[PDB]
Design a protein around this ligand. Structure first.
Ligand SMILES: Nc1ccc(CC(=O)C(=O)O)cc1
Ligand SMILES: Nc1ccc(CC(=O)C(=O)O)cc1
Ligand SMILES: [Co+2]
Ligand SMILES: [Co+2]
Lengths: 379, 379
């Protein structure tokens, strides 16, 4: 049931912005770890005296890393005369965010038909404004509203290259890494209370609900369900403490928990990333025990060959299936010092019409199948 | 002329500690960029609720990356009950340092015979105390005094493995990278006024002076001249603005400008690092024009073959020579967002007795030779 109730025209995920203490080191680690190319920059070398911002791209995935310079470099400026390429940026907000949360996602950015109208309509419908719409070089409009915690939903719209004042980075500094990642599939928030968070966000977007865990969840989706925003809350009382509660504690409250990155070939992606785990890239969660992969034949031997099922097992991939498609997924260990944000790599198979959004779900069945796997391996 | 006036027994450089906003991402970038192995950790997984600290090693070089957790994780603790492995660590100091300076060196650590005596004697001789001596698990004593800006000189002494409460990292997470770097040769500070800085530091250590630039400098050395601490001040009025003044502006004052890392084979090191420049490692300063390498034969054709001189030119290595030894050197671009700290890779040839410290100097003659090179290449 898709009521198609978006209160404004949403297109697709546009970029994710990390607020960093040092954008250079985070962007370089991510580039090597995820196989993303340095695409654009806005920093001192481009006249930005306010923040250093580095854009990595892989397919349609856009990861932006931003850190503040010393405020002294821009002490003379005012908002009308700012050299910041992202006018929403604030030194105090950025430093406060990073000291409070550590490395994390500041903005989930979605492309819309008209960012001014999206902001207007959202705020008229309960959205807490974060940064009013501003037009950049008469070409791009950007506006921000609070999403949850200190994470903003960022609207971007183009009348008609990332953002004005960003420059394309030199080919000598841009090595064409590509491990197969292609787009952002969904971005997941953790909140203390799911009900109020859902009511707030679905309230101002018109996004619709998309049809001992330690958590409860729900997924908000745009009209074509290409912008998917799951939200988790903890469940208290479990024997094992809720991973959402640990997140909230270590993050100092609500924030973005994981980014799901769609791969055009998850096996190549996971081979390429696992090769680099101990040489500056990302670690992955412990693999499921071989019991899990034996039980895979009875569940998805329809969709995957035994050769491909054993390829999952060597890479530690998880597999789930809806009533419509199959989901291949795996999770990294936390991206930085705190047990907060991590990445999920996914590939979806089925639901060809192009592929419809959410095909195969989000792996909810892998909770049950994993604990059953824990019991069979112990035996 | 070496008066051998150390007021306490100094051994050798022990480690360099970076204060980070996220230690994980900086440590991983550095590991891959410099070919340093993850050696030890102190973080949540080791019971440290205060700071995440990661130790990279290459030979005798020890790079430590530290970042604060949320103070809430340790809100119940007091200094007597702290889970911090580095008792000098302070959340407020660390956050203030990183918001003020960005990514930078907090501590230059030297091993001494008795850290308590070194602190006592230093403070009795004008050193501004930073952290009083503390004994760790009856095994290691650590104390800190101000060096310049917010950089501390850290004394470490062992009665008799990095520090108590650090754990050796699992071999699966420790890939044996090695590009040939072996030890810290010197650590360089930038200050607004060289005179007072020298007087202060030489005052409390007894270290002796080691015998249009835009700067003035001087090198303080321990008794055997294995601990070398150069200090720069700007020279105002130059046509091209002083790089020391730019440092001071972007760093918000005095701090560590560069770390010189000795390589057992600078050609292998520079090949390995340059391979990784655009895939998450470090960039290098622009090479000197081929004029410079032609003029190399007339200056060091004694010490290096023409095959090795052309190997310098492809890697962009600089060469200088004292009256005693030859110095091979190259500089990275800044390590993070701000034009502040960078790394120098060096190899020294000559002065065998082991090799005496400072053999070949520090490249001071490469200022003159470089501008003469600029003039000949233009012709
Ligand atoms: N119950 C539940 C439903 C959906 C999600 C979304 C998601 O992306 C993930 O968990 O990987 C999470 C939990
Ligand atoms: N004049 C002068 C003398 C020594 C140094 C020390 C050093 O390490 C470097 O410059 O690379 C710097 C400048
Ligand atoms: Co997910
Ligand atoms: Co040097």
């Amino acid at each position: 049931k898709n009521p198609k109730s978006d209160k404004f025209k949403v297109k697709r995920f546009h970029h994710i912005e990390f607020w960093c203490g040092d954008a250079t080191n985070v962007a370089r680690r991510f580039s090597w770890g995820l196989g993303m190319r340095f695409s654009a920059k806005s920093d001192l070398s481009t006249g930005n005296m306010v923040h250093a911002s580095y854009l990595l791209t892989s397919g349609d995935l856009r990861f932006l890393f931003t850190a503040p310079y010393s405020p002294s470099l821009s002490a003379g400026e005012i908002k009308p005369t700012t050299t910041a390429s992202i006018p929403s940026f604030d030194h105090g907000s950025c430093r406060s965010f990073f000291s409070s949360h550590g490395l994390g996602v500041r903005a989930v950015a979605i492309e819309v038909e008209d960012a001014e109208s999206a902001f207007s309509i959202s705020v008229a419908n309960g959205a807490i404004p974060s940064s009013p719409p501003i037009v950049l070089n008469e070409a791009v409009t950007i506006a921000e509203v609070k999403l949850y915690g200190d994470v903003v939903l960022r609207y971007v719209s183009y009348k008609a290259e990332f953002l004005p004042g960003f420059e394309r980075v030199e080919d000598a500094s841009s090595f064409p890494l590509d491990y197969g990642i292609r787009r952002l599939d969904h971005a997941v928030g953790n909140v203390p209370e799911l009900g109020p968070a859902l009511t707030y966000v679905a309230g101002f977007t018109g996004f619709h609900q998309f049809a001992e865990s330690g958590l409860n969840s729900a997924v908000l989706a745009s009209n074509d369900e290409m912008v998917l925003l799951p939200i988790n809350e903890p469940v208290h009382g479990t024997k094992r403490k809720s991973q959402i509660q640990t997140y909230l504690e270590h993050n100092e409250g609500a924030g973005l928990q994981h980014l799901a990155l769609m791969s055009e070939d998850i096996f190549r992606t996971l081979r390429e990333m696992r090769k680099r785990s101990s040489i500056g890239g990302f670690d992955f969660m412990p693999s499921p025990p071989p019991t899990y992969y034996q039980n895979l034949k009875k569940r998805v031997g329809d969709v995957l060959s035994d050769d491909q099922i054993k390829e999952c097992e060597e890479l530690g991939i998880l597999v789930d299936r809806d009533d419509q498609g199959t989901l291949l997924q795996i999770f990294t260990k936390p991206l930085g010092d705190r047990p907060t944000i991590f990445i999920e790599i996914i590939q979806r198979v089925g639901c060809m019409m192009y592929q419809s959004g959410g095909c195969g779900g989000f792996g909810k069945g892998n909770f049950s199948e994993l604990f059953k796997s824990i019991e069979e391996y112990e035996k």
